Write a protein that holds these residues in place. Structure first.
Motif, PDB file in Angstrom:
ATOM      1  N   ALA E  31       0.814  -1.202   0.000  1.00 25.00           N
ATOM      2  CA  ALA E  31       0.000   0.000   0.000  1.00 25.00           C
ATOM      3  C   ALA E  31       0.854   1.261   0.000  1.00 25.00           C
ATOM      4  CB  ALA E  31      -0.925   0.013   1.212  1.00 25.00           C
ATOM      5  N   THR E  32       0.255   2.345  -0.487  1.00 23.12           N
ATOM      6  CA  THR E  32       0.834   3.675  -0.390  1.00 23.12           C
ATOM      7  C   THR E  32      -0.288   4.703  -0.402  1.00 23.12           C
ATOM      8  OG1 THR E  32       2.399   5.259  -1.345  1.00 23.12           O
ATOM      9  CG2 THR E  32       1.243   3.803  -2.869  1.00 23.12           C
ATOM     10  N   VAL E  33      -0.057   5.818   0.286  1.00 22.97           N
ATOM     11  CA  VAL E  33      -1.087   6.810   0.575  1.00 22.97           C
ATOM     12  C   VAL E  33      -0.561   8.186   0.199  1.00 22.97           C
ATOM     13  CG1 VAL E  33      -2.387   7.946   2.400  1.00 22.97           C
ATOM     14  CG2 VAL E  33      -2.190   5.497   2.399  1.00 22.97           C
ATOM     15  N   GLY E  34      -1.323   8.923  -0.605  1.00 21.50           N
ATOM     16  CA  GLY E  34      -1.001  10.299  -0.928  1.00 21.50           C
ATOM     17  C   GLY E  34      -2.126  11.236  -0.532  1.00 21.50           C
ATOM     18  N   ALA E 191      -2.820   6.590   8.378  1.00 21.56           N
ATOM     19  CA  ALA E 191      -3.494   5.757   7.397  1.00 21.56           C
ATOM     20  C   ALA E 191      -2.753   4.452   7.161  1.00 21.56           C
ATOM     21  CB  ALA E 191      -3.649   6.510   6.080  1.00 21.56           C
ATOM     22  N   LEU E 192      -1.423   4.469   7.197  1.00 28.31           N
ATOM     23  CA  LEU E 192      -0.677   3.242   6.961  1.00 28.31           C
ATOM     24  C   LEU E 192      -0.701   2.303   8.151  1.00 28.31           C
ATOM     25  CD1 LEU E 192       0.694   5.169   4.712  1.00 28.31           C
ATOM     26  CD2 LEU E 192       2.595   3.609   4.920  1.00 28.31           C
ATOM     27  N   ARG E 193      -0.897   2.809   9.358  1.00 30.41           N
ATOM     28  CA  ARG E 193      -1.041   1.890  10.471  1.00 30.41           C
ATOM     29  C   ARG E 193      -2.414   1.244  10.486  1.00 30.41           C
ATOM     30  NH1 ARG E 193      -0.181   5.685  15.349  1.00 30.41           N
ATOM     31  NH2 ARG E 193      -0.552   3.845  16.675  1.00 30.41           N
ATOM     32  N   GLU E 194      -3.361   1.789   9.727  1.00 25.76           N
ATOM     33  CA  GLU E 194      -4.668   1.172   9.583  1.00 25.76           C
ATOM     34  C   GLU E 194      -4.612  -0.054   8.682  1.00 25.76           C
ATOM     35  OE1 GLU E 194      -7.325   2.247  11.238  1.00 25.76           O
ATOM     36  OE2 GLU E 194      -8.703   0.774  10.373  1.00 25.76           O
ATOM     37  N   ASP E 201       4.005  -2.323  13.203  1.00 29.50           N
ATOM     38  CA  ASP E 201       3.571  -1.192  12.397  1.00 29.50           C
ATOM     39  C   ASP E 201       4.628  -0.486  11.543  1.00 29.50           C
ATOM     40  OD1 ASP E 201       4.712  -0.600  14.754  1.00 29.50           O
ATOM     41  OD2 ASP E 201       3.233   0.903  15.389  1.00 29.50           O
ATOM     42  N   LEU E 202       5.586   0.197  12.160  1.00 27.28           N
ATOM     43  CA  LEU E 202       6.294   1.269  11.464  1.00 27.28           C
ATOM     44  C   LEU E 202       7.767   1.315  11.853  1.00 27.28           C
ATOM     45  CD1 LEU E 202       3.742   4.282  11.525  1.00 27.28           C
ATOM     46  CD2 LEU E 202       4.274   2.767   9.619  1.00 27.28           C
ATOM     47  N   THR E 203       8.459   0.186  11.792  1.00 31.60           N
ATOM     48  CA  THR E 203       9.788   0.136  12.388  1.00 31.60           C
ATOM     49  C   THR E 203      10.896   0.733  11.525  1.00 31.60           C
ATOM     50  OG1 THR E 203      10.238  -2.052  11.489  1.00 31.60           O
ATOM     51  CG2 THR E 203       9.087  -1.926  13.596  1.00 31.60           C
ATOM     52  N   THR E 204      10.696   1.962  11.027  1.00 35.65           N
ATOM     53  CA  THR E 204      11.720   2.880  10.488  1.00 35.65           C
ATOM     54  C   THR E 204      12.594   2.278   9.387  1.00 35.65           C
ATOM     55  OG1 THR E 204      13.463   2.376  12.096  1.00 35.65           O
ATOM     56  CG2 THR E 204      11.790   3.966  12.732  1.00 35.65           C
ATOM     57  N   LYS E 205      12.172   1.180   8.778  1.00 36.66           N
ATOM     58  CA  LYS E 205      12.940   0.535   7.728  1.00 36.66           C
ATOM     59  C   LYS E 205      12.049   0.075   6.594  1.00 36.66           C
TER      60      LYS E 205
END
Lengths: 228, 73, 232, 96, 238, 240, 213, 239
Positions: E31-34, E191-194, E201-205
């Motif tokens: 996924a990607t969100v703009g 939105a990306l954690r959804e 979730d979002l481990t900076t890599k």
């Protein structure tokens, strides 16, 4: 009955790109390891007959003085991609008077990898490893028949791929040395190949930051075997 | 909404979302999501239904083929 | 656009080119036509029935001249005939622009039949559906040739193409000999087209062209009624 | 309702099938099955049974009482790579 | 099904299936969100890998100093349009000596990708471009599709499991046209954690952020400089 | 079957289904109507709001071919703006060769032959779009043409393409377009597309209007905002 | 008939230093006996570490600059880094040779920093041959400027003179004086002197007036 | 221009047209080749003479240069156009780099010609395999073979054609070091090998030796009658 060569699946991928991924599970296995001291890179030969000359076949071949390669799957159509990579590094040297980096070699081949059709005829059934030392240190890349390349740290490609990738995640760490990364790979090749390991079934090649692309031969190779 | 009447559904459901992630279905396949989501929760031992139970039920009714495909994007 | 570039005429497992066999069946369902050479010129005759009284019979012609001394009829389907007429009109001109001489009748059949063979092998086309009868008087001796949709050709004394051609060839075998005049050949060519025509054979139901040493010409319907008179 | 797929076994599917059809046959102790499953890339479970039943016959061909590792390898290239003209699978993966 | 082999053949219902199957290829990518503010355009991507030792596949690419894109689909077709994309920006800069407008760029893409969807033996381009840029009229968020039908939008999300990301954007888009770059980004990061499973979730890599800005050239942030943006987010409520 | 795969094969009763299948794709696009007044042409397109995320003014189904010619489409949008490119390119070569602005009886003739050329071969498919062309000239008056995916064009006093085609042109003939100027028309264009598409199938929708004539001085452009707000003031008076 | 070339004048000058590179040029555009403008420099900033000067036919100088600026972008989009100064000089030698049989009438001097922060000067012919030098002067007044810098920078033809390397301060007033002597005797040398200084921190600019004949 | 993909992948990863072409090789006549340390010896079997034809037009041993011979199997129509393209390339090498063509170089030309031809549009692959035998500069005798997929591959002894598995299984139990002791002793290996194949009792065999400095030299069927006598005579007395 007959689709084209350019048809999507109902699941959406393709047919003959996905078929070519199956074709590289029949080639000989190959292992490359990126280490900060340098890139080691090995393969087996799969000798069929006693009457066969062993050194006539090869899987490691060099692209430039600082870039080596390793091939699997089919072999006869791998020689087309190797020759395009050699010419591409010389055109970069001709016009810019420098050495093309290891990553930008790979995308020059990967743009060629998906160009079949019915104008101007099938995807390439090979899988490649690219070991090299550019100005960012030692690098290791792996392309696909699909044209997808990504930097790996220790990639195992061939018929024994997933058996080796499990045994390779447990021995690798970020602070290896090149003398033990060579020894670590031959333990993995000893488990997965059919015949017993000697100085003729396999060959290695390493690239260091200091010296250029060096390929081992049957005199300096078997000291690692007897001291396995 | 009709066939989810007798099931213990938590108020974490967006049927306007669930109708929108199910396109090209019919009245049998929309009924078939409610029964499959009502069985995946029985696997994990839950008693109420959450939103991800329906989204996993959709993947079973579509009947996709699983072939090692994570090399996109 | 572009084409297909593949032959749709292949060998059967029995070794027969099937589309050429089917194209000959379209030739056999055509209008009957006879052609007889006799010792000073060649007579071509065909059979032309309009479907109703509304048609203008003096509009199109079966018997066609190719040059001063070469005529040509057919027995097959209509629109395929007009293609290789216009092709054969041009081939007589490139021979004349080189050699400054009217083309021999043998050399014309070399080049018309080579079109039809080239046309039954190339990509994305079906073969022609006509056979031809070609006459002419080159160097005194007259000639009579017959091609086919396959691309072969022959040298006949007398033959018949179209419907009931197997009955026409038996009729010509019991009638034709080596010694006839041109006007005797006309009377036996109308007599063999009468074997398969309708009830009335008027001056516009048939169409006859002749060759002499004076060259090829086509008969007007006035004297065609004279030959049709005192017949049978 | 349910639409269960029966695909071809991946690698560990194949290694388990050898352990089923060869658990009850007189074998050499020191053979490895994992080498055998790498030699049969797209092979059904029906072929793996016929590999095991063929390689026992090689032991019955000469004299002996238990098969070896090379008795399997003489059965692999005969069943997989010599009967490969038929193979029955590749026009059925597309289901036509 | 015989209506399901070539791009040329229409269905008896009137839906060409080879276009619809290329929509499945963009649903396989990550996924990607703009989204955009009044003065900024932010697109946030979510990388994937194969093993834990191989690197993550990058998705955000630099087209020009005021145009960046984000891909979803098979990457070899993405580079085939990206090289077309770079070429059409710098020759207009060669001729007219001006930045090419964003809305006029995408109309070249829609004409480029419509041609193989009508010939014989030509596949559609399976790719999922989200485009963020600057005209003189401020920010723009565009998406394309393999059906060659580009959409003007103010917030979208495409890739695998993207419907949950759209539900977050609809109930928060009243706030997007006011906030500065700091919580504009961590609106998009919420939105990306959804669109993730409930443990990682979002481990900076695996995340990358691109911003084009009213005085800011288009800039890609990767896995070290993400850490100022990525901090300051609450825990996932459960 | 087998007679309906290519566009190069007739049926055993003599019709091409690949054209008829492509016509069926038009009745999934929504509605585009256009009627011509006494002294001009007024287009009208009702536009579905698919989701809240799109922008007001996105993906316009109403193009602008030349300075005086307008286009409103209904079909598969990628094929619509592909036809809009060649029609825009055809009008440029008329002016560069013949010096003056292209007339409509020639312009719709050149486009329809280009549409017709894709219903002959197996190598291409037919287009999945139907559209309308309207303009105004001081030496010719107003014109209104319409092109189906087969390649057939005619003139109209008012036409409609979309899902509810018959349900839209039922009320068009209730009007009297022979005498009305293009000011009262704009309220009557919007009214007849409010009685169509009930709120059951669609949640919300968007009005999009167009406008040409000597009141626009021959140029084609969109309506101003205040005039279409009067038509949306004229919206909720159809409930009586 | 139609001749495709004309001479627009111009004079450029570059000096390689120990940790710097100075590129200067006049700002007069003129052909024939007339004057087009009194403000048209030749200092073109390629990167932050490379400045090129282009003198000769002005229609080719406009084209060649825009060809180069495209290919610096194509390198970065394909290699994820900017070009070095030596890579630019090897590239532009192939561009000039590519029109071997209809050449550019442009004299080129590339000044800038190398990878070690030292000065580098590459001078070109209109066909595309080059070498690396310490100082070059190109253009109309190149016959006047080159003998002066052999004496001062090169320390040539002198006896018992110590060899100190050129500082930044000495090299500024050396450039400013040598254009004043060149503006007197050359009719093409112009009015403002644009001096661009490339250091390890950026590019500075400076404009010095001259006489305005 | 016929544009159609002939060679496509299978759903399990094979190229069917390639391995169908390998069965066209598997019913051509048998060709055997070994190398000695000073003289190479290769010779086809199954001449299959009908005593009414010219014996020279049926030959399958041809020369690409003075130093390079070539044998093949498969279908002879595709063979003699690969040869005629290889004669052109080994001649144009001499206009370039002045030395004659090494035997390894010409096999890379043939195999790369044969590979890309299973890659183009509208072309079925070749249905031949080859044996290229040559003693290069500095006198190193060596040989190669060519799969129809295009994989050049060196050997010490090899055999292709109909009945190639039995002959190769015969050579591995028979290729010793002292079998290549004498020049007349290496020939006794080949004539013993082809006799262990499709019958060829001195009437269907045609050896062709090369002594590293001459051209090819076909012995007529008198020494083959002399060699087959003594090859059976040693077998007559030991058993």
């Amino acid at each position: 009955y007959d689709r084209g060569v350019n048809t999507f699946s109902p699941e959406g991928r393709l047919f003959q790109v996905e078929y070519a991924i199956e074709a590289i599970k029949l080639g000989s296995t190959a292992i490359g390891i990126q280490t900060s001291e340098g890139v080691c890179l090995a393969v087996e030969k799969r000798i069929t007959s006693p009457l066969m000359e062993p050194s006539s076949i090869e899987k490691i071949v060099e692209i430039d003085a600082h870039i080596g390669c390793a091939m699997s799957g089919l072999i006869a159509d791998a020689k087309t991609l190797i020759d395009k990579a050699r010419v591409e590094t010389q055109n970069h040297w001709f016009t810019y008077n420098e050495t093309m980096t290891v990553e930008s070699v790979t995308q020059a081949v990967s743009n060629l990898a998906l160009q079949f059709g019915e104008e101007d005829s099938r995807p390439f059934g090979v899988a490649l490893l690219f070991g090299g030392v550019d100005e960012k240190g030692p690098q290791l890349f792996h392309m696909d028949p699909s044209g997808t390349f990504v930097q790996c740290d220790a990639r195992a490609i061939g018929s024994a791929s997933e058996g080796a990738q499990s045994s390779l995640q447990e021995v690798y760490h970020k602070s290896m040395t090149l003398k033990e990364a060579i020894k670590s790979s031959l333990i993995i090749l000893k488990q997965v190949m059919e015949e017993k390991l000697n100085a003729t079934n396999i060959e290695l090649a390493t690239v260091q930051p200091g010296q250029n692309f060096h390929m081992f031969t049957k005199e300096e190779l078997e000291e690692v075997i007897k001291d396995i | 909404q009709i066939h989810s009447r007798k099931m213990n559904v938590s108020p974490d459901v967006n049927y306007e979302e669930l109708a929108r992630c199910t396109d090209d279905f019919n009245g049998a396949q929309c009924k078939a999501v409610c029964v499959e989501a009502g069985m995946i929760a029985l696997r994990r031992g839950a008693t109420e239904l959450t939103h991800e139970d329906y989204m996993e039920g959709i993947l079973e009714v579509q009947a996709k083929k699983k072939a090692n495909l994570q090399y996109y994007a | 656009e572009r084409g297909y570039s593949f032959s749709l005429t292949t060998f059967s497992p029995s070794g027969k080119l099937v589309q050429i066999e089917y194209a000959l069946a379209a030739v056999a369902g055509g209008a009957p036509s006879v052609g007889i050479k006799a010792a000073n010129g060649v007579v071509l005759a065909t059979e032309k029935k309009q479907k109703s009284i509304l048609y203008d019979e003096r509009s199109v012609h079966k018997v066609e001249p190719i040059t001063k001394h070469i005529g040509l009829v057919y027995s097959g389907m209509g629109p395929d005939y007009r293609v290789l007429v216009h092709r054969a009109r041009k081939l007589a001109q490139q021979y004349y622009l080189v050699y400054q001489e009217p083309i021999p009748t043998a050399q014309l059949v070399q080049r018309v039949a080579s079109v039809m063979q080239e046309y039954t092998q190339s990509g994305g086309v079906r073969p022609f559906g006509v056979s031809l009868l070609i006459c002419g008087w080159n160097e005194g001796r007259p000639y009579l040739f017959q091609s086919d949709p396959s691309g072969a050709y022959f040298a006949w004394k007398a033959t018949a193409m179209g419907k009931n051609y197997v009955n026409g060839k038996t009729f010509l075998e019991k009638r034709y000999n080596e010694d006839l005049e041109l006007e005797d050949a006309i009377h036996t060519a109308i007599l063999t087209l009468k074997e398969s025509f309708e009830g009335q054979m008027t001056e516009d139901n048939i169409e006859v062209g002749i060759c002499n040493e004076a060259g090829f010409r086509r008969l007007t319907p006035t004297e065609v009624k004279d030959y049709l008179a005192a017949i049978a | 309702d349910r639409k269960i797929e029966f695909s071809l076994p991946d690698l560990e599917g194949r290694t388990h099938i050898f352990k089923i059809h060869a658990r009850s046959m007189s074998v050499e102790r020191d053979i490895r099955f994992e080498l055998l499953a790498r030699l049969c890339p797209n092979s059904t479970g029906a072929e793996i049974r016929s590999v095991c039943t063929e390689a026992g016959m090689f032991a019955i061909r000469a004299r002996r009482k238990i098969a070896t590792e090379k008795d399997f390898l003489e059965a692999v290239n005969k069943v997989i790579k010599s009967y490969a003209k038929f193979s029955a699978t590749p026009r059925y993966m597309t289901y036509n | 099904n015989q209506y399901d082999n070539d791009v040329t053949v229409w269905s008896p219902q009137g839906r060409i299936h080879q276009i619809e199957y290329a929509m499945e290829a963009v649903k396989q990518g990550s996924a990607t969100v703009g989204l955009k503010s009044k003065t900024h355009a932010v697109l946030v991507a979510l990388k994937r890998a194969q093993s834990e030792l191989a690197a993550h596949q990058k998705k955000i690419l630099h087209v020009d100093n005021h145009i960046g894109i984000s891909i979803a689909g098979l990457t070899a077709d993405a580079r085939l349009l990206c090289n077309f994309m770079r070429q059409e920006c710098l020759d207009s800069r060669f001729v007219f000596d001006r930045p090419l407008p964003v809305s006029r760029l995408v109309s070249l893409i829609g004409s480029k990708t419509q041609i193989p969807t009508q010939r014989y033996g030509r596949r559609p381009y399976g790719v999922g471009l989200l485009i963020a840029g600057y005209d003189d009229m401020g920010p723009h968020i565009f998406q394309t599709c393999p059906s060659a039908n580009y959409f003007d939008c103010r917030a979208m999300s495409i890739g695998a499991r993207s419907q949950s990301a759209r539900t977050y954007l609809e109930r928060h888009m009243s706030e997007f046209m006011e906030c500065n770059l700091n919580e504009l980004v961590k609106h998009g990061l919420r939105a990306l954690r959804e669109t993730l499973p409930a443990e990682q979730d979002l481990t900076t890599k695996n995340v990358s952020i691109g911003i084009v800005g009213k005085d800011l050239e288009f800039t890609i942030y990767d896995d070290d400089d993400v850490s100022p943006f990525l901090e300051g987010l609450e825990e996932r409520p459960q | 079957t087998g007679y309906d795969l290519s566009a190069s094969t007739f049926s055993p009763d003599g019709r091409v289904f690949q054209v008829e299948y492509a016509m069926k794709a038009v009745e999934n696009s929504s509605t585009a109507i256009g009627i011509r007044c006494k002294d001009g042409v007024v287009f009208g397109v009702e536009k579905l709001v698919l989701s809240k995320l799109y922008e007001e003014g996105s993906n316009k189904r109403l193009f602008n071919v030349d300075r005086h010619v307008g286009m409103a489409v209904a079909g598969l949008l990628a094929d619509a703006r592909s036809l809009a490119d060649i029609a825009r390119e055809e009008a440029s070569n008329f002016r560069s060769n013949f010096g003056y602005n292209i007339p409509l009886k020639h312009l719709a003739d050149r486009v329809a032959m280009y549409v017709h050329a894709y219903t002959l071969y197996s190598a291409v498919r037919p287009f999945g779009c139907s559209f309308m062309l309207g303009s105004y000239s001081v030496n010719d008056g107003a014109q209104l043409y319409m092109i189906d995916p087969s390649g057939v064009s005619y003139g109209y006093w008012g036409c409609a393409i979309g899902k509810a085609r018959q349900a839209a042109k039922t009320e068009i003939e209730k009007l009297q377009m022979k005498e009305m100027t293009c000011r009262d028309i704009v309220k009557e264009v919007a009214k007849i597309i409010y009685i169509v598409h009930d709120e059951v199938k669609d949640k919300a929708f968007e009005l999009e209007l167009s406008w040409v004539g000597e009141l626009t001085n021959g140029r084609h452009e969109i309506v101003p905002k205040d005039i279409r707000e009067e038509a949306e003031k004229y919206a909720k008076e159809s409930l009586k | 008939r139609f001749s495709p070339y004309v001479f627009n004048g111009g004079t450029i000058l570059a000096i390689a230093g120990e940790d710097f590179a100075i590129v200067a040029s006049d700002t007069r555009l003129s052909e024939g006996f007339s004057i087009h403008t009194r403000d048209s420099p030749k200092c073109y900033k390629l990167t932050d570490k490379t400045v090129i000067g282009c003198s000769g036919f002005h229609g080719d100088c406009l084209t060649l600059t825009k060809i180069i600026e495209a290919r610096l972008k194509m390198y970065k989009h394909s290699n994820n880094k900017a070009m070095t100064t030596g890579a630019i000089a090897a590239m532009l030698s192939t561009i000039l040779y590519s029109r071997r049989f209809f050449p550019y009438y442009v004299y080129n001097i590339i000044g800038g920093l190398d990878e070690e922060g030292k000065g580098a000067v590459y001078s070109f012919d209109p066909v595309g041959s080059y070498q690396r030098d310490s100082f070059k002067a190109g253009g109309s007044a190149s016959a006047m400027l080159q003998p002066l810098l052999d004496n001062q920078v090169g320390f040539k033809n002198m006896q018992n003179v110590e060899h100190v390397p050129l500082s930044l301060d000495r090299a500024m007033r050396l450039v400013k004086d040598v254009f004043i002597s060149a503006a007197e005797r050359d009719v093409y040398t112009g009015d403002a002197l644009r001096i661009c200084i490339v250091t390890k921190e950026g590019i500075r600019e400076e404009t010095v007036s001259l006489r305005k004949d | 221009s016929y544009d159609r993909a002939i060679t496509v992948f299978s759903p399990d990863g094979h190229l069917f047209q390639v391995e169908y072409a390998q069965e066209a090789v598997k019913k051509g006549s048998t060709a055997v080749g070994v190398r000695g340390r000073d003289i190479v010896v290769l010779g086809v079997e199954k001449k299959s003479v009908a005593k009414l034809q010219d014996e020279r037009t049926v030959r399958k041993i041809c020369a690409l240069d003075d130093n390079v011979c070539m044998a093949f199997a498969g279908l002879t129509a595709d063979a003699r156009i690969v040869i005629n393209r290889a004669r052109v390339e080994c001649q144009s090498h001499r206009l370039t780099v002045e030395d004659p063509v090494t035997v390894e170089y010409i096999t890379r030309y043939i195999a790369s010609l044969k590979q890309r031809y299973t890659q183009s549009n509208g072309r079925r692959p070749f249905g031949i395999s080859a044996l290229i035998v040559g003693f290069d500069f500095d006198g190193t005798p060596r040989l190669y073979q060519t799969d129809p997929s295009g994989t050049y591959h060196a050997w010490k002894a090899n055999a292709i054609g109909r009945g190639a598995k039995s002959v190769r299984e015969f050579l591995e139990k028979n290729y010793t070091d002292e079998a290549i002791e004498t020049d007349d002793l290496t020939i006794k290996l080949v004539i013993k090998a082809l006799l262990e194949v499709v019958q060829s009792g001195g009437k269907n065999i045609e050896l062709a030796v090369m002594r590293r400095d001459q051209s090819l030299k076909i012995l007529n069927p008198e020494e083959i009658e002399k060699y087959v006598a003594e090859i059976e005579k040693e077998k007559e007395e030991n058993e």
